[PDB]
Write a protein that binds this ligand. Structure first.
Ligand SMILES: Nc1ncnc2c1ncn2[C@@H]1O[C@H](COP(=O)(O)OP(=O)(O)OP(=O)(O)O)[C@@H](O)[C@H]1O
Lengths: 458, 258, 86
């Protein structure tokens, strides 16, 4: 929903209101034109017949669309078809080369997301794209991007998960830009000091980007006067203590990534209390990180999604027993942490919804040593690659779970799921037969019951 | 039961519950014991032109009278005045928007010497004063803090209500739903329309809807016909009064002005 | 009377008492079932507490629906099992 609402905002369909986009999505899903589907209601989709009806209506309309996504296209379509079209979509195709320069005078949207091999776009491709308002090149392999001084009216530009290393200087002359996203750009290394010329920008995202504000020299984001939401990667303690004051640049951040953290052997949520908008934290390759403090001192910031990845020295996180900042958590992803050996705090996470535990052999159990279950709102559990895990947690009731998936876990002995629960929300269970052989059971009927009811082999 | 004047007026803003009050009052008379012989419910809200014909049709049908279609309106009015004078009647008038003469529609004005009563509801205190109901006026006030909330709850679907109903388990969705309910100002029409609009809100969407409802109401379903319904009180005004009313809208919300 | 009224494909909110149907209440045994493409209409008509969603047909039921729609000779080409064909 968020991605679609972003485009609805850039395209001008929404008068700068995201709630209007949510209302439109809800009106569509209430008329059965869209379907809410997924592990969480954040994703929408179209029924096949409804999509064909939409394409038929587009063909009946006087404004042509060029729509070939998911067609497994191996080469770009003929450049002559791009003349009169207004919306172009080349999603999920295997396009490898984009060399022609089209005549797209009327186009107001370009989508090339999920093109894994498209890395050679011809220079001067955007010459006729003056009216292009939405441009998406997410999850493509381009390392360089053609000059775009002709993009006078562009307002949205997405380059997440692409191999772009340096970003052309023509963007700072794009006066109409409103949203620019370069999250998870592995190769991005270009200084953003010229972003000050981008006054009109409203959203800038660098979450999980390999490059960011490595030093205070590039803390000049106070020139971004129109900015509302930002995500960036912070590398050092001195940066945090330069940002640990109440000002918009500190509080406007909604999520952080922590990579190659220097001198940040410990961190407290009280230190993040000045980040009143922060909701997601990512910690990757923090070599000297040892402990984290989950204080009882609450914050207006609501922590929602966390991911701990590739941490070779993290040991434990101190979580208060009665009240804590983690109680608003929705998603936890624990990955590649061999020295982490304390995850007992999860049982106090009553709003928690998603579990991802992977390759963390230091975790003995997900919950090691009120008339309420420890996971009252849980929906999804994902387990992968655990070579030394014993069991998940003690015997508790799990009636609200939707899906359980376990892969490559030859050491897992048992799971807390049992036939004692009532199930209507448990949609499916996926896993291996060897895990079923190694599974301990509360009752010997569970050998066949939990297999014939929900288990789906991998 | 006890008021001295036989003409009773109820006034209040659009959607406060005047017509529903008349319905629940008429339906309540059949439960208790009373000396009255006919309880007539008449919808004068049909127009401001006072369509005499169907009002007389309702009165005659309610009095077991034959409908002489070709009879002149004045003769029928005199005949109804004679007929209604023989019975202890209660006439409930709905949303009377202009002063109109009762004797020209067939209704005799009740007096102290007669046990008959006449209850009229209108948005305007000026109309209730013009119809000689000054000594028995009642102001129909908006709903209370708790009654408005429990009205809002009944308007939500089962799964949606299951998110905001429970206590003991604490989450901000209850606060967002309560903010949306308070944005209705306790007006039953507002509670109905807004609760119907957000009757199917999922758990995670309450925040944005509650945040947006505090500032604007054009993007929410069913409120356009709400404002069309409430707009008559504004269209009745003279252009100077219309400009003076719009001039008051730019003062801060929840703030009294001198 | 204890009535059951089945309304089909109601596309806008309408007043039942204007058409002559009394709205059923807890005191009465009468029922009223309405079908509509829009959930907003079903909420407007006071059916929020008893809403059902009509889901699409299953994988196998849809197939056997498709089979019954074909002619005899055409069905004879796609019905048989044991013999395998594209
Ligand atoms: N006490 C109440 N509880 C629940 N709903 C109520 C209550 N009072 C009024 N309503 C609702 O108010 C809505 C608006 O219609 P209502 O008959 O109340 O209007 P009104 O006060 O006569 O105003 P006007 O005639 O000027 O439109 C009705 O649909 C009814 O359901």
């Amino acid at each position: 929903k968020e991605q679609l609402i972003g485009y609805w905002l850039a395209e001008g369909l929404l008068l700068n209101d995201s709630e209007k986009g949510y209302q439109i999505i809800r009106s569509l899903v209430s008329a059965c034109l869209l379907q809410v589907s997924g592990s969480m209601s954040s994703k929408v989709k179209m029924h096949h017949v409804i999509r064909q009806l939409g394409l038929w209506l587009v063909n009946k309309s006087d404004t042509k669309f060029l729509v070939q996504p998911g067609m497994a296209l191996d080469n770009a379509p003929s450049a002559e078809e791009w003349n009169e079209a207004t919306r172009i979509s080349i999603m999920s195709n295997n396009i490898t080369e984009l060399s022609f320069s089209p005549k797209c005078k009327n186009v107001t949207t370009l989508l090339m997301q999920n093109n894994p091999n498209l890395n050679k776009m011809s220079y001067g491709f955007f010459r006729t794209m003056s009216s292009l308002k939405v441009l998406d090149l997410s999850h493509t392999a381009i390392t360089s991007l053609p000059e775009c001084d002709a993009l006078v009216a562009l307002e949205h530009l997405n380059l997440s998960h692409t191999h772009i290393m340096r970003l052309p200087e023509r963007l700072w002359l794009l006066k109409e830009l409103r949203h620019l996203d370069l999250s998870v750009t592995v190769a991005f290394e270009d200084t953003m000091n010229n972003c000050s010329k981008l006054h009109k920008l409203k959203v800038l995202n660098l979450f999980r980007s390999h490059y960011g504000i490595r030093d205070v020299d590039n803390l000049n984001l106070d020139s971004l006067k129109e900015l509302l939401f930002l995500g960036i990667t912070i590398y050092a303690e001195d940066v945090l203590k330069k940002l640990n004051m109440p000002r918009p640049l500190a509080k406007s951040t909604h999520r952080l990534n922590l990579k190659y953290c220097a001198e940040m052997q410990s961190i407290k949520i009280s230190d993040l209390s000045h980040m009143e908008h922060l909701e997601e934290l990512y910690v990757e390759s923090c070599y000297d990180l040892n402990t984290v403090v989950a204080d009882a001192e609450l914050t207006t910031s609501q922590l929602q999604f966390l991911t701990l990845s590739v941490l070779p020295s993290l040991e434990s996180v101190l979580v208060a027993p009665m009240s804590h900042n983690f109680q608003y958590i929705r998603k936890l992803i624990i990955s590649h942490c061999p020295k982490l050996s304390n995850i007992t705090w999860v049982r106090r996470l009553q709003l928690l919804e998603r579990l991802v535990i992977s390759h963390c052999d230091g975790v003995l159990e997900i919950v090691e040593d009120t008339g309420q279950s420890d996971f009252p709102k849980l929906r999804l559990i994902v387990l992968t690659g655990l070579k030394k895990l014993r069991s998940i947690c003690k015997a508790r009731e799990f009636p609200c779970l939707e899906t359980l998936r376990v892969e490559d876990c030859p050491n897992l002995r048992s799971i807390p799921l049992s036939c004692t629960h009532n199930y209507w929300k448990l949609k499916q269970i996926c896993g291996s037969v060897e895990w079923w052989e190694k599974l301990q059971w509360e009752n010997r009927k569970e050998v066949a019951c939990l297999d014939s009811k929900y288990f789906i082999p991998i | 039961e006890k008021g001295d004047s036989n003409i009773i007026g109820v006034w209040g803003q659009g959607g406060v519950g005047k017509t529903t009050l008349l319905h629940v009052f008429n339906n309540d008379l059949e439960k208790k014991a009373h000396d009255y012989q006919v309880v007539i419910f008449i919808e004068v809200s049909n127009s401001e032109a006072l369509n005499t014909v169907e009002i007389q049709q309702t009165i005659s049908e309610r009095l077991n009278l034959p409908w002489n279609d070709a009879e002149p309106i004045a003769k029928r009015a005199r005949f109804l005045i004679k007929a209604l004078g023989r019975k202890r009647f209660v006439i409930l008038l709905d949303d009377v928007r202009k002063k109109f003469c009762l004797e020209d529609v067939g209704i005799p004005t009740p007096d102290i010497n007669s046990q008959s009563k006449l209850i009229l509801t209108s948005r305007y205190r000026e109309v209730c004063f013009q119809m000689n109901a000054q000594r028995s006026l009642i102001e129909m006030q908006i709903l209370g803090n708790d009654a408005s909330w429990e009205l809002f709850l009944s308007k939500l679907s089962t799964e949606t209500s299951a998110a905001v109903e429970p206590l003991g388990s604490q989450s901000a969705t209850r606060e967002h739903a309560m903010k949306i309910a308070q944005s209705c100002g306790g007006l039953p029409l507002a509670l109905n329309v807004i609760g119907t609009a957000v009757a199917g809100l999922e758990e995670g969407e309450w925040q944005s809807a509650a945040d947006a409802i505090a500032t604007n109401m054009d993007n929410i379903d069913g409120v356009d016909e709400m404002f069309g319904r409430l707009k008559y009180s504004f269209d009745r005004l003279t252009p100077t009064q219309q400009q003076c009313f719009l001039y008051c809208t730019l003062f801060p919300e929840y703030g009294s002005i001198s």
